[PDB]
Design a protein around this motif. Sequence first.
Motif, PDB file in Angstrom:
ATOM      1  N   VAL A  58      38.284  45.035  51.866  1.00  0.00           N
ATOM      2  CA  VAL A  58      37.900  43.683  51.483  1.00  0.00           C
ATOM      3  C   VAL A  58      39.130  42.791  51.395  1.00  0.00           C
ATOM      4  CG1 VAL A  58      36.696  42.275  49.808  1.00  0.00           C
ATOM      5  CG2 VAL A  58      35.996  44.614  50.163  1.00  0.00           C
ATOM      6  N   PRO A  59      39.058  41.585  51.979  1.00  0.00           N
ATOM      7  CA  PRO A  59      40.135  40.588  52.002  1.00  0.00           C
ATOM      8  C   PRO A  59      40.811  40.340  50.643  1.00  0.00           C
ATOM      9  CG  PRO A  59      38.467  39.935  53.528  1.00  0.00           C
ATOM     10  CD  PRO A  59      37.889  41.102  52.738  1.00  0.00           C
ATOM     11  N   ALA A  60      42.135  40.455  50.619  1.00  0.00           N
ATOM     12  CA  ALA A  60      42.893  40.286  49.394  1.00  0.00           C
ATOM     13  C   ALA A  60      42.814  38.894  48.785  1.00  0.00           C
ATOM     14  CB  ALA A  60      44.327  40.664  49.633  1.00  0.00           C
ATOM     15  N   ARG A  61      42.180  37.956  49.483  1.00  0.00           N
ATOM     16  CA  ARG A  61      42.055  36.598  48.950  1.00  0.00           C
ATOM     17  C   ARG A  61      41.085  36.582  47.773  1.00  0.00           C
ATOM     18  NH1 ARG A  61      40.620  36.805  53.831  1.00  0.00           N
ATOM     19  NH2 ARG A  61      38.452  36.904  54.585  1.00  0.00           N
ATOM     20  N   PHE A  62      40.208  37.587  47.718  1.00  0.00           N
ATOM     21  CA  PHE A  62      39.230  37.722  46.636  1.00  0.00           C
ATOM     22  C   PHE A  62      39.884  38.371  45.424  1.00  0.00           C
ATOM     23  CE2 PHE A  62      36.433  37.513  50.368  1.00  0.00           C
ATOM     24  CZ  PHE A  62      35.559  36.525  49.941  1.00  0.00           C
ATOM     25  N   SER A  63      40.026  37.604  44.353  1.00  0.00           N
ATOM     26  CA  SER A  63      40.650  38.113  43.143  1.00  0.00           C
ATOM     27  C   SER A  63      39.638  38.406  42.049  1.00  0.00           C
ATOM     28  CB  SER A  63      41.683  37.114  42.611  1.00  0.00           C
ATOM     29  OG  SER A  63      42.720  36.888  43.552  1.00  0.00           O
ATOM     30  N   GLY A  64      39.664  39.641  41.564  1.00  0.00           N
ATOM     31  CA  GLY A  64      38.762  40.019  40.503  1.00  0.00           C
ATOM     32  C   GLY A  64      39.507  39.967  39.190  1.00  0.00           C
ATOM     33  N   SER A  65      39.061  39.089  38.299  1.00  0.00           N
ATOM     34  CA  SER A  65      39.677  38.923  36.989  1.00  0.00           C
ATOM     35  C   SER A  65      38.657  38.925  35.864  1.00  0.00           C
ATOM     36  CB  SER A  65      40.450  37.606  36.937  1.00  0.00           C
ATOM     37  OG  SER A  65      40.597  37.170  35.594  1.00  0.00           O
ATOM     38  N   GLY A  66      39.112  39.321  34.678  1.00  0.00           N
ATOM     39  CA  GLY A  66      38.237  39.333  33.518  1.00  0.00           C
ATOM     40  C   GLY A  66      38.042  40.666  32.823  1.00  0.00           C
ATOM     41  N   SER A  67      37.455  40.595  31.638  1.00  0.00           N
ATOM     42  CA  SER A  67      37.167  41.776  30.849  1.00  0.00           C
ATOM     43  C   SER A  67      36.504  41.354  29.560  1.00  0.00           C
ATOM     44  CB  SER A  67      38.443  42.548  30.534  1.00  0.00           C
ATOM     45  OG  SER A  67      38.153  43.622  29.653  1.00  0.00           O
ATOM     46  N   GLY A  68      35.383  41.990  29.237  1.00  0.00           N
ATOM     47  CA  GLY A  68      34.668  41.666  28.011  1.00  0.00           C
ATOM     48  C   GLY A  68      33.336  40.962  28.203  1.00  0.00           C
ATOM     49  N   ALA A  69      33.393  39.663  28.487  1.00  0.00           N
ATOM     50  CA  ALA A  69      32.193  38.858  28.703  1.00  0.00           C
ATOM     51  C   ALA A  69      32.589  37.616  29.493  1.00  0.00           C
ATOM     52  CB  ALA A  69      31.577  38.467  27.369  1.00  0.00           C
ATOM     53  N   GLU A  70      33.802  37.653  30.030  1.00  0.00           N
ATOM     54  CA  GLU A  70      34.359  36.557  30.809  1.00  0.00           C
ATOM     55  C   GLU A  70      35.024  37.136  32.057  1.00  0.00           C
ATOM     56  OE1 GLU A  70      35.630  32.673  30.572  1.00  0.00           O
ATOM     57  OE2 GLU A  70      35.225  33.728  32.462  1.00  0.00           O
ATOM     58  N   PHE A  71      34.353  37.037  33.200  1.00  0.00           N
ATOM     59  CA  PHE A  71      34.929  37.552  34.432  1.00  0.00           C
ATOM     60  C   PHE A  71      35.121  36.414  35.409  1.00  0.00           C
ATOM     61  CE2 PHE A  71      34.389  41.997  33.293  1.00  0.00           C
ATOM     62  CZ  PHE A  71      33.432  41.893  32.285  1.00  0.00           C
ATOM     63  N   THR A  72      35.977  36.631  36.397  1.00  0.00           N
ATOM     64  CA  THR A  72      36.260  35.587  37.358  1.00  0.00           C
ATOM     65  C   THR A  72      36.643  36.141  38.718  1.00  0.00           C
ATOM     66  OG1 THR A  72      37.059  34.141  35.582  1.00  0.00           O
ATOM     67  CG2 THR A  72      37.680  33.563  37.831  1.00  0.00           C
ATOM     68  N   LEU A  73      35.889  35.733  39.731  1.00  0.00           N
ATOM     69  CA  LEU A  73      36.143  36.154  41.093  1.00  0.00           C
ATOM     70  C   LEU A  73      36.784  34.936  41.750  1.00  0.00           C
ATOM     71  CD1 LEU A  73      34.487  35.811  44.124  1.00  0.00           C
ATOM     72  CD2 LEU A  73      36.040  37.704  43.596  1.00  0.00           C
ATOM     73  N   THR A  74      38.099  34.807  41.593  1.00  0.00           N
ATOM     74  CA  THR A  74      38.828  33.673  42.161  1.00  0.00           C
ATOM     75  C   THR A  74      39.299  33.972  43.582  1.00  0.00           C
ATOM     76  OG1 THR A  74      40.129  34.153  40.142  1.00  0.00           O
ATOM     77  CG2 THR A  74      39.934  31.855  40.825  1.00  0.00           C
ATOM     78  N   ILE A  75      39.137  33.007  44.484  1.00  0.00           N
ATOM     79  CA  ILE A  75      39.523  33.182  45.885  1.00  0.00           C
ATOM     80  C   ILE A  75      40.606  32.192  46.330  1.00  0.00           C
ATOM     81  CG2 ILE A  75      38.648  33.358  48.223  1.00  0.00           C
ATOM     82  CD1 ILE A  75      35.813  33.522  46.802  1.00  0.00           C
ATOM     83  N   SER A  76      41.719  32.711  46.850  1.00  0.00           N
ATOM     84  CA  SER A  76      42.830  31.876  47.300  1.00  0.00           C
ATOM     85  C   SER A  76      42.464  30.886  48.401  1.00  0.00           C
ATOM     86  CB  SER A  76      43.988  32.760  47.772  1.00  0.00           C
ATOM     87  OG  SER A  76      44.432  33.610  46.724  1.00  0.00           O
ATOM     88  N   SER A  77      42.846  31.186  49.631  1.00  0.00           N
ATOM     89  CA  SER A  77      42.532  30.265  50.712  1.00  0.00           C
ATOM     90  C   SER A  77      41.194  30.625  51.354  1.00  0.00           C
ATOM     91  CB  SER A  77      43.647  30.280  51.758  1.00  0.00           C
ATOM     92  OG  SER A  77      43.582  29.112  52.546  1.00  0.00           O
ATOM     93  N   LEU A  78      40.108  30.167  50.724  1.00  0.00           N
ATOM     94  CA  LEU A  78      38.742  30.425  51.178  1.00  0.00           C
ATOM     95  C   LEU A  78      38.650  30.450  52.703  1.00  0.00           C
ATOM     96  CD1 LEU A  78      35.705  29.072  49.420  1.00  0.00           C
ATOM     97  CD2 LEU A  78      35.658  29.329  51.914  1.00  0.00           C
TER      98      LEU A  78
END
Lengths: 214, 229
Positions: A58-78
């Motif tokens: 899977v493309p490294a532009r997809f960033s998986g962040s978060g833990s607990g009840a707040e997660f974030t799938l942030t993507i660099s250069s879409l």
Amino acid sequence: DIVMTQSPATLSVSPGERATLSCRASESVSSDLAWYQQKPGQAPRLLIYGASTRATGVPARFSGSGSGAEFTLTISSLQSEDFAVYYCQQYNNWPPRYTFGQGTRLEIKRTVAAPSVFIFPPSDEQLKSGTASVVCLLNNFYPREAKVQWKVDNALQSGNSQESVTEQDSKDSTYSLSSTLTLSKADYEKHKVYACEVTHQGLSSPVTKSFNRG
Amino acid sequence: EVQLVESGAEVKKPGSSVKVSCKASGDTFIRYSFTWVRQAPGQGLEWMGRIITILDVAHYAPHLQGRVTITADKSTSTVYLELRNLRSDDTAVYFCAGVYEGEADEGEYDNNGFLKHWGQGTLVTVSSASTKGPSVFPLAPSSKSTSGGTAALGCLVKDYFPEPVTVSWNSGALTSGVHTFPAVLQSSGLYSLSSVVTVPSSSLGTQTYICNVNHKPSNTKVDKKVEPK
């Protein structure tokens, strides 16, 4: 009983730019959170799992962040191919009672394009059937937000009609509404003028395109 | 690296029962835990349940307990999803999804909730309607509306069932500059979409426009000449 809410119901952004998605969870789900990507008409795609780990291939532009009840799938250069609805899956409780987010459409934001309304009358052959169908196309436009009204004899009657937007395209990257007032045979004949008012954001002003039986 | 195959789309009537198959191939079956994920049209993923295959135990979704079951035939290497007492809302694309668990045949088991391998998806239409081919109606090209450049015209596949329907213009040639809309469910229980193609007016009267609508379900292929009428 866990509710997973993906705040950004819809996110319009342009290619190359950075897109951010936020999944909100009821109680803590620790790190048992995955992210999926779904192209219209395709099985989802496991992007991230365990909150911050990408699935094999899977493309490294997809960033998986978060833990607990707040997660974030942030993507660099879409990317062009990065257009799809995104889903977060919660899989931490046990017994198994996994829940999905409600989604987020990662649509491409472009230039506010106005809709070219084409009103199509009910083919006589179709009228011989027993009903009449007036199709009021709305070609190539953007913000899918396009309020349409069916006025029969300047009558704001709003009922027997049903819209249908199309997905984001490839080249143009616009949408195309399709409102359809389906009347009877004896009532289609009972009315004279059939107008279709399109009130789009990229429309300088309301644009009524109609026709009189004939 | 497995590949999941599903049973065909089935059209079931209210209060009935449906069983969707899912062939698992390309790896060790018992090392995978399979999950069924359904998705209603326009709707989003809903967790239906998951079977810890090797153990032959399966847990389900609250709002489904009782009316759903997940089983696996280790012999044939298949997983099944059965919903009984089908309602209209159950109408959805039922996905088969799996994930590797580890040397489960050796006692090791990660018991993963996410789903790495998904099925092609099986559509199940639970409605009281009956299978019936469509009816195509030509949409007179706006000749008294649009001119100067190009004009848009199309077809109106109305009253068809169950789903889905493919669309192509001019035997399959003019597939460009066409906007085939997603079908729409009418109160009757039937669906109806529309296909259109904005093409130059100066080509009305030489290139007999014909949208090619097919509906394998009813086994009814329809062609309609969209004369610039």
